[PDB]
Design a protein around this ligand. Structure first.
Ligand SMILES: N[C@@H](Cc1c[nH]c[nH+]1)C(=O)O
Ligand SMILES: N[C@@H](Cc1c[nH]c[nH+]1)C(=O)O
Ligand SMILES: N[C@@H](Cc1c[nH]c[nH+]1)C(=O)O
Ligand SMILES: N[C@@H](Cc1c[nH]c[nH+]1)C(=O)O
Ligand SMILES: N[C@@H](Cc1c[nH]c[nH+]1)C(=O)O
Ligand SMILES: N[C@@H](Cc1c[nH]c[nH+]1)C(=O)O
Ligand SMILES: [Mg+2]
Ligand SMILES: [Mg+2]
Ligand SMILES: [Mg+2]
Ligand SMILES: [Mg+2]
Ligand SMILES: [Mg+2]
Ligand SMILES: [Mg+2]
Lengths: 143, 143, 143, 143, 143, 143
RNA sequence: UUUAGUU
RNA sequence: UUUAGUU
RNA sequence: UUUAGUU
RNA sequence: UUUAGUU
RNA sequence: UUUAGUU
RNA sequence: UUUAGUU
C-alpha cells in the first residue's frame, strides 16, 4: 500500500508548484532534480528531462533499464500536457515547462523497490506570448 | 497574459493537494467546487464532477454552453489520469479520485472572461487494494 | 484521378444532408443505402450500418472481404463523430445519427474498382435532450 | 435545443460542398469565411484557418479566448480528416483542402451565445497526384 | 546491448507460433508461461494473462511492482492487436488469442536485470465465425 | 474461414523471424518481398515498404487501389511498433527494422480474393546503440 | 456528486 | 538540460 | 438496421 | 491564409 | 487463466 | 527500399 507520507506523485507536484525542499526530500532518502525547458519540439522536452536526471544522479547514466523506466514515465507525463496528440510544433503550439523528477519507494513495503515520478507544469499555447493557458502532467513508473 | 496571482490551474491543484481555502478563493471572486469519486466507469467520474459543479453553482444548471465547456475540461483532465486509453474497468483498472473545479478569469485582461479548470488527484490500479499508484489530471477551458 | 462527377464522399454527404436522389444515384450505377440510428453504444451504430448495407445489397452478405471493407470505412467515419475516443456511453455521451453508405467507382480509371463511403450526420451530447451539438463523419475505403 | 434552421454544422458543410451564400448567411447574422489550403504540414492548415478567420472578422484578433475556441474546433475537424493520427507528412501523406468557418448561435435560446464550426473538405493521399481519396472534418465549439 | 541468443521478443513469438520448447527455455533460465483466451472484453484478456503469469510463477504474486510491469507490457501488446482503439466488444469485434509470457534478461550485461515480454497471436473479427483475420501483438517491459 | 495452411499473418512473421522460403511461398502462389529499413522518420519506413513492394511486384505500381490497401496495412503494422503514438524522432526514438510483405488469399473460399500482410520486426530505442528493445508489428488488409 | 477495487 | 513563441 | 438520452 | 504532392 | 462470436 | 542512432 502507498505510504501516506511518501506519496511520490504528490510530493513531486508540490515541489514543482512551490518555486531546501530538495534538501529535505534528499534527507528523507529521495533522489530529486528540478529543471525547466521550453520548446515546440517534444524531443527537446524529453531530452532535457533525461539529461538533467542523469547528471543530477536521479537515474543511472549507464545501462538501459533506468533510462527505459524514465522514458516511459516521461511519456505518461506528456499525455497530461498534450491531451490526445503528443505533438507540439506540428500542431502549431508551444510549451514552456518546469519539471521535477523524484525517485524513491512510495510504498509501505520496502520490497516494492524504487519508483520514479516525472512531473510537468507550465503553459501551452499558440506561438505568441499570452495566447496560452496552464498545462500539467504526471507520469509514474517502477525502476 | 496570465495573471501571476490568478493561475487557475496551479490554484486548483494546490487546493486539491491540501481551512476553507475555498473561502479565500471565493473571497477573491473564484467559484469553487470540491469532491471525491471512485469507480471503474469513467462516466461515473464525469457525472460526479458535473453534478457537484452544478449543485455548488460553479457552472449554470440551465443551458448547454457551460456544460459543454465543463465536459471538455473534464475530458482533458481525464487524459492525464488515463494516459492513452480513456478506459478504466474495460482495461481492468479502477480509480479513486479527489477533484476540484475552479471558475474565474486567470488573465490580466478582464476581456478574457471566465475560464474553468478541472483537476484530479488520486490512485489508479488493478481492482485490488494496494496494487495502485498515484494519478493526476488537469483540464482547462474557456467558459 | 478522382472523377469530378463521381466524388463518392461529397455525393454521400449531399444525400445525407438533403425525392429518390437515390434513384438518380442508382441510375448512374451507384449502390446506395440510407438509415438512422441513435445509441450510447458504438457497436449498435456499427451494427445498424452493416445490417442496412447488407439488406439493401450495398455489400455482399456472404464472405468477409466486403464486410471487412465496410467495417473499416465505418471506423474511419466514427473518428469524425467521436474525435479522439471512440466511446459514447462510457464517456457519458449519446449520439443520434442519420447515415448513408454509397458504393461505386469514384475514379476516372475503371481499373480502380469499387470503393465505399460511410457518412454520418446528427447530434452528440450529454444524455439530456438539448444538451448537444452536431457531429459529422466520413470514412472511405476500397472494396 | 438546436434551431432547425440555424444548424451551424450542416450549414457550414453545405456552403463548403457547393463551390452569395456567404451573403445570405451574413444577412442572417452569421459570420463566415471561406478558404483553401494544401500541405503536408498540419500546422500550415491550422494557421491558414486561423489567419483567414481573424482577417475576415469571424473571430477577434485580440485576446486568447476566441483563438482558443477556434484552435480546439480546428483540432476536432482535423480528427475527421486524419482519422487516428493527426499527422500528414510524417506519415507520408498530403492534404488538399477547402474550408469554411461559421460563427453564430445555432440554438433556439439566445442565451446559448455564439458557437463556431470549422468544416474541412478535400483529398488526402500519397504525395502523388491521383493517389488520393476524399476527406472530411467538422469541429464545433462554443465561443 | 541485446544478446543475440537471448532476444526475448523473438523467442516469445517463435514459441507462440510453434515439445517443451518451454523446457529448453526454462533450462536456459527463462520463466515461461503459455495460455489461450478469447473474448469481447479486453479486461478478460488482461486477466487471463495475469492469472496465468502468477500461477506459473512468471511474476511474483505478492506486491505491485511486478504486476505493474506485466500490466504495461500487456497494454503494449494489446496495441498491436487492437491497432488504434483498445476496444473489442464495444466496437463489435471479438478476439481469439494464444499468448506467451517470457521473463528473463535479454541483454549482454547482467546489470540490465529481468525484462518481460507479452506476445499475442490469434484472430480478431466480427462476432461471426469466419468473418475474421489474424492479429498480433508484442509488449516488452523491464521488471 | 481462414485456411489453416495459408495463414498469411503467421507465415509472414515466421519468414521475418528466420533470417528459399521466399521460393517455397512463391511456389505456393504467394507474392513476397523482404526488406530492411532504419530511421527516426516514420515516412521513410512507409516509403521503403511501398517501394520494395512495388519493385518486387507484390502490389501493382499503377493505380491507387493496391497502394491504398498497402498504406493502411502498413499503418496497422506501425501501431504494433509504436504502441500509442505513431512518432519516432519527434519522441526521441529510433527504429531498426526488417520487414516482410506477403500477398495472397489466406481463406478457404477462393472468393475472398487477395489479402496483404505487412510484418515488422526489429528494435526501437533511444538514439544510442544498445539503449533499445525489440518491437513487432503486423497489419493485414484486403486487396 | 459527496474515492474505486479481486481475474 | 539550466521555460517556448507570430500564421 | 429502419436517431439516442438524465448524473 | 488565398488546396498539397514522388519513396 | 487454461481462444471469442450473430446486428 | 536494400535496419536507425547521442540530449
Ligand atoms: N489551447 C491549446 C494550445 C494552443 C494552441 N494554439 C492556441 N492554443 C491546448 O490546449 O493545448
Ligand atoms: N498501472 C496502470 C494501472 C493498473 C492496472 N493494473 C495494475 N495497475 C496505470 O498506469 O494506469
Ligand atoms: N461535447 C461533447 C458531447 C457531450 C457530452 N456531454 C455534453 N456534451 C462532444 O463534443 O462529443
Ligand atoms: N489513404 C490514406 C492516405 C494515403 C497515404 N498514402 C496513400 N494514401 C488515408 O486514408 O489517409
Ligand atoms: N477488421 C477488424 C475486425 C472486424 C470487426 N468486424 C469485422 N472485422 C479489425 O481489423 O480489427
Ligand atoms: N522504450 C521506448 C523506446 C525508447 C526511447 N528512448 C528509450 N527507449 C519504446 O518502447 O518505444
Ligand atoms: Mg519501451
Ligand atoms: Mg463538444
Ligand atoms: Mg481489419
Ligand atoms: Mg486548450
Ligand atoms: Mg502504471
Ligand atoms: Mg485511406
Amino acid at each position: 500500500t502507498l505510504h501516506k507520507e511518501r506519496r511520490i506523485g504528490r510530493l513531486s507536484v508540490l515541489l514543482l508548484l512551490n518555486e531546501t525542499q530538495v534538501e529535505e526530500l534528499e534527507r528523507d532518502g529521495w533522489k530529486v532534480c528540478l529543471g525547466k525547458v521550453g520548446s515546440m519540439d517534444a524531443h527537446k522536452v524529453i531530452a532535457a528531462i533525461e539529461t538533467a536526471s542523469k547528471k543530477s544522479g536521479v537515474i543511472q547514466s549507464e545501462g538501459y533499464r533506468e533510462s527505459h523506466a524514465l522514458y516511459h514515465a516521461t511519456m505518461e507525463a506528456l499525455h497530461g500536457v498534450t491531451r490526445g496528440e503528443m505533438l507540439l510544433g506540428s500542431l502549431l503550439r508551444t510549451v514552456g515547462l518546469r519539471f521535477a523528477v523524484l525517485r524513491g519507494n512510495p510504498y509501505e513495503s520496502e520490497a516494492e523497490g524504487d519508483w520514479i515520478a516525472v512531473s510537468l507544469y507550465g503553459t501551452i499555447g499558440a506561438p505568441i506570448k499570452g495566447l496560452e493557458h496552464e498545462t500539467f502532467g504526471v507520469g509514474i513508473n517502477h525502476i
